[PDB]
């Protein structure tokens, strides 16, 4: 007749998830690029995207306090739960997730490795130095991320025990930021040359367009293919794997220039910039350390080390495979 309530409400919840994740990814990519353009190398031996993940965890620390259902799911208990896995969809898998650059972290580690085995992998000096720098960069990234998560949880407790200051006071600011993003995405993107005139204006347009699709792909991977095998969510892992191989392939396509003339082909400021925007948005919205950190030492007692090791090693082995 009119409708079907048990279906119309399910559709409304689904479209709410879609809108929230899209808006969160769009608003998080701009923060990522603000941090990246604010690299200002100075010290920070690694620098670049290093801070971004460190940011994404800390803010995520204020969500995991009230996340519960994810925490409960990674605790094999409480039969009458059946709750939404990514509660706070617009913040957990959205701003906190999209900002993370797991694929970019692995790419940075591999690039700083710079072909550890220069001519022979058996030699101690080159191999030891390469493995030392690779371990150092990976340890720095993940230790800083976990520390940021720890300070996030601690500060969440310290601010929660005093006064919540009404949660909806943050809901209103989130909504107004959503309207500002909508207005900007309308006017600035629509009023432009049809060839998407160059400069700083187009440098983010294609990345913004491609980011929410990667975020959606990761969200659906982390909802459908998740919790299929116990103690191994396998959703975030496959998302990160797909992201890192895709980024490696397209970086070889851009940076490698295997025919040699591919750089000459991308001399035109369209072919290289679409790949750059893809690197910015798609693989960056598909690979998340924030969800990775939550699956890490947040919970999943003991066995967490196995998941971390398998993920990191398989990703590195893949990106090595693209080298061949």
């Amino acid at each position, epitope marked *: 007749g*009119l409708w*079907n*309530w048990f279906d119309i*409400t*399910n559709w409304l*919840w689904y479209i*709410k998830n879609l809108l929230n994740i899209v808006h969160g990814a769009i608003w998080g990519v701009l923060v990522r690029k603000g941090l990246m353009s604010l690299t200002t190398y100075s010290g920070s031996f690694l620098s670049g995207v290093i801070w971004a993940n460190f940011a994404a965890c800390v803010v995520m620390g204020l969500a995991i306090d009230g996340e519960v259902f994810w925490i409960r799911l990674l605790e094999e208990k409480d039969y009458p739960n*059946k*709750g*939404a896995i990514p509660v706070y969809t617009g913040l957990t898998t959205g701003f906190c997730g999209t900002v993370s650059s797991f694929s970019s972290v692995i790419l940075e580690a591999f690039n700083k490795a710079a072909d550890t085995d220069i001519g022979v992998r058996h030699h101690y000096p080159n191999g030891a130095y390469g493995i030392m720098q690779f371990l150092a960069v990976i340890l720095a990234q993940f230790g800083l991320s976990i520390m940021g998560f720890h300070m996030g949880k601690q500060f969440s407790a310290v601010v929660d025990n005093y006064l919540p200051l009404v949660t909806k006071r943050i809901y209103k600011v989130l909504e107004l930021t959503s309207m500002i993003l909508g207005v900007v995405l309308v006017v600035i993107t629509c009023i432009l040359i049809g060839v998407k005139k160059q400069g700083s204006w187009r440098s983010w347009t294609f990345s913004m367009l491609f980011a929410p699709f990667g975020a959606l792909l990761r969200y659906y991977l982390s909802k459908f293919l998740n919790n299929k095998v116990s103690n191994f969510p396998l959703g975030t892992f496959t998302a990160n794997f797909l992201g890192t191989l895709l980024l490696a392939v397209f970086t070889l396509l851009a940076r490698g220039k295997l025919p040699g003339g591919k750089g000459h082909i991308v001399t035109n400021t369209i072919a290289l910039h679409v790949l750059e925007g893809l690197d910015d948005g798609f693989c960056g919205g598909l690979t998340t350390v924030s969800t990775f950190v939550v699956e890490l030492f947040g919970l999943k007692t003991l066995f967490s080390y196995r998941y971390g090791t398998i993920s990191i090693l398989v990703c590195f082995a893949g990106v090595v495979l693209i080298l061949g």
Partner: antibody
Amino acid sequence: EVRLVESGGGLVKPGGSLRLSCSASGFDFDNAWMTWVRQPPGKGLEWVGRITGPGEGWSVDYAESVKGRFTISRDNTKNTLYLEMNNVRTEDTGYYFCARTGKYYDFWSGYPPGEEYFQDWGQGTLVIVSS
Amino acid sequence: SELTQDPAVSVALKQTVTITCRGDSLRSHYASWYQKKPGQAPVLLFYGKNNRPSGIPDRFSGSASGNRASLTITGAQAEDEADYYCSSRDKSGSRLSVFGGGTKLTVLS
């Protein structure tokens, strides 16, 4: 001026049967849900079940202590709500209320299929299942 | 006992007081509230986020946060003495509803 009046009380021997009717008028009845709520005397009231409309084909639901022992069906032509009981246990005693059900689901905060709120209630009927 | 409540609460006249509804399913579902005087039909009081039916005095305000659902009465009058019930989903996303164990409120006369 909406009103719901229950009828069909009286004592019932355990294991017997009883049919409860609810007269309702003054509001759209073919598109509004009905919910049976019972209250044992001196205790807290309990949920029995709800019956839907054309949205799902007049579906049913029941309480975990009631599932399989009660029956809820609706006759839209006569604008009345019917409740059927068989194999009545001693705990079924108390006041039976039939109350119209509202539907509520915020579009931004919530989880399907949302909450249910009763925009009105009825005077009530008394059943005493005593041996 | 899916929903738990305070069995009885006391408050003097013109002084505010709160009625606390605690449950697991309230995290992903809002609550409802029903004034119940003895021998009378319960009347809907407060439901959802900020929805209140027309006619009821403004003194009944409810808030939802965490795993608690709170209906706070401001200035309980002489006729406000009754039992108040909270109802919502039993399982977090199931096609059912349940009710609390009882909350008797007594205005100190």
